[PDB]
Swiss-Prot record:
The active site is at 143. It comes from the Eukaryota. An L-amino acid tripeptide binds at residues 105-108, 166. Disulfide bonds join 117-196, 158-180, 160-163. Zn(2+) binds at residues 142, 146, 152. Potent fibrinogenolytic protease which cleaves mainly the Aalpha chain of fibrinogen (FGA) and slightly the Bbeta (FGB) and the gamma (FGG) chains. May possess hemorrhagic activity. Compared to other SVMP, the substrate-binding pocket is relatively shallow. Is less susceptible to tripeptide inhibitors than TM-1 (AC U3KRG1) and TM-2. Coiled coil: none annotated. It comes from Protobothrops mucrosquamatus. Residues 6-201 form the Peptidase M12B domain. This is Snake venom metalloproteinase TM-3.
Amino acid sequence: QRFPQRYIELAIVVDHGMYTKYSSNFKKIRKRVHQMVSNINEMCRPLNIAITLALLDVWSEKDFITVQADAPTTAGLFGDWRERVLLKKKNHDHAQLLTDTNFARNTIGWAYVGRMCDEKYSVAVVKDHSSKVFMVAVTMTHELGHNLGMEHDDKDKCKCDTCIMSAVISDKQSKLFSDCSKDYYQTFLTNDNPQCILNAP
């Protein structure tokens, strides 16, 4: 393998709007979240990262944070709640909030760059913006990529046009990480090397 074995234990939180969107059907939601995780796991296979779902939390009654239009603001509130509440329920490495919120600036996903394992900043927020599971899962993977220290693909650095870290998603979206992405991940493992992803479940 090009990379050493790593493990990311995910917590996925489905907010109340998304719960309502799927007819308040917990089983339907769980199936969809599992299908998303299976895609994230497949996309990280070439990075030698095993992706597991450590925790699924569905906000079936009400939202515990204000899931607002500005994605960065929502991500900060989510990180706070993840550190204060979710991590106390079950340990995990990274958490993503799935929502049906129409985020400002036509945003479908957002995450902090290079903060994997951080108690508050190892998070992403993702809009359930397509009926196609893969389109949402690749957005979750793109945000995970940012959290693993990846920036967008740049044509001078690598040639892939439709890879996961492309600057904009497309209908022809690939499930592959570009060489720009792999090089950023190598830099991240060399310079940051966060301990939580070294630990297998």
